[PDB]
Design a protein around this nucleic acid. Structure first.
Ligand SMILES: Nc1ncnc2c1ncn2[C@@H]1O[C@H](COP(=O)(O)OP(=O)(O)O)[C@@H](O)[C@H]1O
Ligand SMILES: [Mg+2]
Lengths: 516, 93, 88, 107, 98, 107, 93, 95, 86
DNA sequence: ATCGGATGTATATATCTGACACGTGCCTGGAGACTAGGGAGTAATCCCCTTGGCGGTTAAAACGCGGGGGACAGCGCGTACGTGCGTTTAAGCGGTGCTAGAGCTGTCTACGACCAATTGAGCGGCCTCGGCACCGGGATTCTCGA
DNA sequence: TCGAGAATCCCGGTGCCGAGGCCGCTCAATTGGTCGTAGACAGCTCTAGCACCGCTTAAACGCACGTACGCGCTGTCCCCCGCGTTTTAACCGCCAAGGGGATTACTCCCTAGTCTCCAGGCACGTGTCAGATATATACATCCGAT
């Protein structure tokens, strides 16, 4: 409790079978395939076979009394699932959709840990830099009686905070960004870390990441991950998530890969995914976004199969035949020919109609913006290239519409000002330029209703997150996705690969939450 | 006895680039030493190149590269043109 | 408008910053530096770099490769009479 | 079975057989290709003609018939490519280019 | 009034702290960019290696330091302490480069 | 019988056989003698021992137990004849000798 | 993929001059380059020296004259003495 | 009576146009074969060898004096002083 | 040979000869201290070149120094000379 | 601003001497078979490159300003050079004699090239634990304005 | 001028990564034997290097005189350094997918080297003659004093 007294519990003044035995005892109650990993890394790893060879219910009905305000019943179910997860010496992944509310559930579960079994910290929380304040606010609001600091600033400020509170053990939560964890590990490697919580666990995918390696060096009683969408593209990434969760069990990537992904059985189908549902049922929890929400109506996603232009065809053939050193050149040409140097006609440059018809997509694009403009709609172009987004900006100038652009080079204050002015009440702002993988999740463009994915991405999750900039809670009229695809080109290839990835994700995970 | 020299050939070139002038003995000795020095420089560069590339033979490609590496600019390109012309004429005969 | 003509990317020779020339000058042991030194330095640097790179590219062209190697650079320096120890 | 020289075949003046023998006996490589002597002889002949034309022009400017080391030196030092090629070379009985710094001349 | 160092006493300190370290004094990425720009004027579509660029940078900085030493001697010989482009030109012409 | 390396038979540390093979493969002459590799290995050993002794002295002066390019440079440039032998050589990750002209010092 | 170098030999030489003293990788590479360069200089000078006298063998006499030509001043007599010592020991054993 | 500088310029123009050797032959030969006796006793010299030595020496000295003159000019003088020769040799790398 | 070995022959490189060399170099005005410096530099150059030439001629087991040995020594030092063979 | 001298600069004429053409031998380059091994062509393969975009830290880099000291110019002056004239002296030349020792030829033998078997030395792969880099903090030293 | 105030050196503590052993294997040294053939040694020879010696006469030496130039001193700007904001770009960490150069491993052909002859091109020795000095002489032109 007292800083000096709590120093005796925080700092680390000093084959963990002690919890491993109970872990396996509870885990083998399910299907026997769970022990296949250990029967593999027992011949592979003899030291871990010493536990296999030998071999409280708190439903927590109502919303926590110790927290402020009322807590939603589905969040009650989630936090009870976290409680059950704790009282089994196992760790899981909460995977509710963005905006459903996960920070509240996590901090309510921490309040459980602190006020029902009396362990006031330490707790490490890792999140993207933009979210830290939005964590501290809920920390102070829902359970006010707790101390926490953001551990931010220049070297001097962070060192002062470390000396004042970290080594002095004057905290309960030590919320810190992804970069801070790497920056200061030695001062932070020894707090014994009851839990380590990672919001937006999409970052921890590659096992060779510096963040991954650093996090493996930490010593913690138990872990936890928060992430809206696990398994973006591959299955090995989900394996990496699970491996970080429980390295005792998921210590064999090749096993899981050859099990489903690296080798899909030559049977008809679905036996292996039934076994996957059995395996991951106790580990990962996810709920349908539309399970309790009504409100947001579903999106009217459409494809506009545009052709090609004469100059576009010429350039595309010139690229196909064989200064340019990638297949992405095809994606540039299929996108807009002006990206190349010399395509623009003449050292004198103009802005008249000589660009609209020269680009295949932008013709139908202009038609659709017009048709919506005499209908009272706003546009959220999400191209994949900032350089091309300049071309679209020039075109919008020619048509005399209103910019509001946030690329990756837009300063944070400029970003928030643009969000404010566009999302403001009635204003002269027709189109909203934006690059898909920009801004993180701190954008709430709920005023508009029409989004046009100008290009397509390799993984569908990026597009889905981009489409959530207008389909989140809030906007309650209509959503019209208008992704543009050009036929007989590499764009068809990337669309097909994205579709197969989305189907894989659907079958693997999007059948669990139906049972959940 | 019978010391070889490039005189008889330097004279043949001279009485086609200026078929009216002559050349003194000291000048001819200087020309001979110049030809020998350039030969040694080019051949040494070519041998070093062949040794670098693990090759066991010296051929027109190494000779051309050594020329292009030792002569400056216009001399290099003109000498390369002359060498390739001579090699093609030799092979087509 | 007309943003499709983005920038100039002023000059990679101007990428050699005045503090960098000043640091090299300090290692050389000079006390006061005139204001016009920073252009002569860039000129002589560019001349030296082209002289070495021409021979390095010649070597890598003869080898029928497409990647200039530390060995090619070392050979070019040795040819110019600037033997370099430490790279092979 | 009449014998005609490799120099005659290649249309050169310098000897190709002698260059081949020098390359073989000079301990440059284990083996010597067939076109290397031709290429090297052509290059030598070109360089000789290039320097010797300039020497003859200098001799004519000096109103002389036979060229001398002074004319050779004048040609080499006046031509910039040749001056760079023969930079570290001193020519016997050559001399210096007429050159006086402007500061030394009277006002 | 805050204290101030007399002109030159910080230049001397920098001199003796830079004649004692060993690292490279030019930034890495700008030098790499300059090298690629120069190289793409002899034959397009080449690539370099990190070790090649490091060796080239080493040779380059050695060259410029050795040039600045002779420039300093020329400036001192001219009864000066400030190095001027005349000194670089003289040091390069005497050395034989140009 | 029992093999005995030529290095051991000559009382050296450097590889006499490897030196002999390099001398035969380097296109230096048609034949190489028997004592030439021994002589060359002895010379190389002497030179490397000299430079390493100076470098170790420098490293011990800097209170360190590894020789680094700084110590190699500092040992080479502080010996007049070694520096004359390596006058045109540059040592990567080396440096310069601490040297400030006396005119530049404060009055 | 084998790549030879004088690393073990330079280390053996170091361990008898400074018995307790290591060496980094970069210094090792610099010493290897130094040995290669000195070998190339001596061998090339010996080759030229044998070519001038119309000999075909490189022997200890050419090597000794080459080290006398290359090594500076007082550094040359110690190398010559070491070479002669090694040659006599080898030819007597 | 001419004024200081006129005869010097005339001499510069005269000697920059000639080709012969500016050092007497026997004194230089005596110097050469006195220096030679420090390396081996009872040597003989080809006349061609002595002439080659003289021409190399003269070329070296002329090329050194040109750089010495440039050093003197750089310091705003017209008189060459020993410091100029020392600076030229030091920069050139000979010292 | 045994011909009454002499000294101070560096004084044979006389002041007018040094002045003529300076004039060919393009020097108008000459300080009086330059002659000893010139004698020193000439003596150093000659010592180096003659040392190399004598080494060559002694390796060839000869007693006569030849123009070819001198040329080889000059080329070894990097001052290639045209006009005496080679 | 014009004269009076001294110094190249053309213009003729005689004199060698050293390029240039011619004849003679022989050594080397060309023609022709024969052969083997170097290098060219094919194909796996695989790891690192490429292009376009993103987010965050944190020093360097760029800029502005004051003010000091250094460069640059001008002035005096007092040597230290240049120029010119006699006076010796030693180089340069022509000639001669002598002998050391470069240079060539013949024999033959010792020693390097080449090849087959054999096997230790050295190189690639792997692992670990000290040497050195980095970070307070305390003491010492050095500069600058009283 | 001594006492701030700043910068640097010198002590402990981490901590981390590369240097330095240890091991297996494979491939170049090593040993033994055979066979040309370079070079080593004797002998000869004839060339050129060395040593005097006399004569001429240009170049070096010594000394004078008198400018002009190198060096020291004094002002005056101006421009470069030291220092405090503030701005940005280098430098990490990432994603997403390719494919393209670089590197073995193998087969086979074709172009080098190696011989044997044998003409003919080039080196050597000789014998002109005309190109380049070697004197003279008149003219142009700078230079320095009027
Ligand atoms: N009393 C409450 N009960 C449930 N949810 C609430 C309550 N008050 C606020 N919330 C919501 O909980 C949400 C937390 O979700 P958010 O901050 O978007 O992060 P995430 O999307 O990761 O869950 C907030 O957006 C907030 O609107
Ligand atoms: Mg969230």
């Amino acid at each position: 409790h007292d800083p000096e007294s709590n120093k005796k519990r925080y700092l680390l003044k000093d084959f963990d079978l002690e919890g491993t035995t109970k872990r396996f005892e509870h885990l083998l109650s399910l299907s026997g395939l769970f022990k296949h990993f250990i029967e593999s890394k027992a011949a592979k790893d003899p030291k871990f076979r010493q536990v296999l060879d030998v071999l409280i219910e708190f439903q927590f009905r109502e919303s926590p009394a110790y927290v402020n305000g009322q807590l939603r019943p589905y969040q009650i179910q989630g936090v009870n699932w976290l409680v059950s997860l704790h009282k089994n010496k196992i760790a899981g992944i909460l995977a509710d959709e963005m905006g459903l509310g996960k920070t509240l559930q996590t901090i309510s579960f921490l309040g459980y840990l602190r006020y029902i079994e009396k362990i006031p910290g330490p707790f490490l929380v890792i999140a993207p830099k933009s979210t830290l304040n939005n964590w501290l606010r809920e920390i102070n609001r829902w359970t006010p009686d707790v101390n926490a600091f953001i551990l931010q600033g220049d070297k001097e400020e962070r060192a002062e905070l470390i000396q004042k509170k970290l080594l002095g053990c004057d905290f309960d939560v030590v919320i810190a960004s992804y970069e801070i964890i790497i920056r200061e590990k030695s001062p932070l490697k020894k707090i014994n870390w009851e839990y380590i919580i990672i919001d937006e666990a999409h970052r921890i995918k590659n096992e060779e990441s510096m963040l991954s390696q650093v996090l493996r060096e930490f010593t913690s009683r138990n872990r936890l991950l928060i992430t809206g969408t696990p398994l973006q593209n591959n299955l090995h990434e989900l394996w990496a998530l699970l491996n970080f969760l429980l390295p005792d069990i998921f210590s064999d990537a090749q096993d899981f890969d050859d099990w489903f992904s690296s080798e899909s059985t030559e049977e008809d189908q679905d036996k292996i995914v039934k076994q996957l549902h059995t395996v991951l049922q106790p580990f990962l929890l996810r709920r349908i976004k539309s399970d309790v929400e009504t409100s947001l109506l579903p999106k009217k996603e459409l494809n506009l199969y545009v052709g090609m232009s004469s100059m576009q065809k010429k350039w595309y053939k010139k690229i196909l035949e064989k200064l340019l050193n990638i297949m992405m050149q095809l994606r540039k040409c299929c996108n807009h020919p002006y990206l190349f140097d010399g395509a623009e006609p003449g050292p004198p440059y103009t802005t008249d109609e000589h660009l609209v018809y020269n680009a295949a997509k932008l013709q139908v694009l202009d038609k659709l913006l017009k048709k919506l403009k005499e209908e009272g709609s706003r546009v959220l172009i999400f191209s994949q290239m900032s350089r091309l987004l300049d071309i679209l900006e020039d075109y919008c100038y020619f048509r005399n519409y209103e910019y509001c652009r946030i690329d990756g080079s837009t300063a944070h204050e400029d970003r928030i000002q643009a969000i404010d002015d566009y999302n403001a009440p009635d204003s002269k702002k027709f189109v909203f330029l934006l690059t898909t993988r920009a801004g993180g999740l701190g954008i709430n463009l709920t005023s508009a209703d029409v989004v046009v994915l100008y290009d397509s991405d390799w993984n569908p999750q990026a597009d889905l997150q981009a489409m959530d900039r207008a389909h989140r809670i809030g906007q309650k009229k209509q959503v019209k996705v208008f992704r543009l695809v050009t036929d007989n080109s590499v764009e068809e290839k990337i669309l097909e690969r994205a579709t197969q990835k989305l189907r894989l994700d659907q079958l693997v995970i999007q059948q669990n939450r139906t049972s959940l | 006895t019978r010391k070889e020299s490039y005189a008889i050939y330097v004279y043949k070139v001279l009485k086609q680039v200026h078929p009216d002038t002559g050349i003194s003995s000291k000048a001819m000795s200087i020309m001979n030493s110049f030809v020998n020095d350039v030969f040694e420089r080019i051949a040494g560069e070519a041998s070093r190149l062949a040794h670098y590339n693990k090759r066991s033979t010296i051929t027109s490609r190494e000779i051309q590269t050594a020329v292009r590496l030792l002569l400056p600019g216009e001399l290099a390109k003109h000498a390369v043109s002359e060498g390739t012309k001579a090699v093609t004429k030799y092979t087509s005969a | 408008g007309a943003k499709r003509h983005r920038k100039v990317l002023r000059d990679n020779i101007q990428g050699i910053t005045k503090p960098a020339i000043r640091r090299l000058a300090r290692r050389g042991g000079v006390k006061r530096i005139s204001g016009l030194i920073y252009e002569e330095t860039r000129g002589v640097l560019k001349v030296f770099l082209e002289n070495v790179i021409r021979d390095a590219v010649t070597y890598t062209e003869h080898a029928k490769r497409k990647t200039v190697t530390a060995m090619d650079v070392v050979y070019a320096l040795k040819r110019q009479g600037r033997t370099l120890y430490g790279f092979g | 079975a009449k014998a005609k020289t490799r120099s005659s075949r290649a249309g050169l003046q310098f000897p190709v057989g002698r260059v081949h023998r020098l390359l073989r006996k000079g301990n440059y490589a284990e083996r010597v290709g067939a076109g290397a002597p031709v290429y090297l002889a052509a290059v030598l002949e070109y360089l000789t003609a290039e320097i010797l034309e300039l020497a003859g022009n200098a001799a004519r400017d000096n109103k002389k018939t036979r060229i001398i080391p002074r004319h050779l030196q004048l040609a080499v030092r006046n031509d910039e490519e040749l001056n760079k090629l023969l930079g570290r070379v001193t020519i016997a009985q050559g001399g210096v280019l007429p050159n006086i710094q402007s500061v030394l001349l009277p006002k | 009034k805050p204290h101030r160092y007399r002109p030159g006493t910080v230049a001397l300190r920098e001199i003796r702290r830079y004649q004692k370290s060993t690292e490279l004094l030019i930034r890495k990425l700008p030098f790499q960019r300059l090298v690629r720009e120069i190289a793409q004027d002899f034959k397009t579509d080449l690539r370099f290696q990190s070790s090649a660029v490091m060796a080239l940078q080493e040779a380059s900085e050695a060259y410029l330091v050795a040039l600045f030493e002779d420039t300093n001697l020329c400036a001192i010989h001219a009864k000066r302490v400030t190095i001027m482009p005349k000194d670089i030109q003289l040091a390069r012409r005497i050395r034989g480069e140009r």
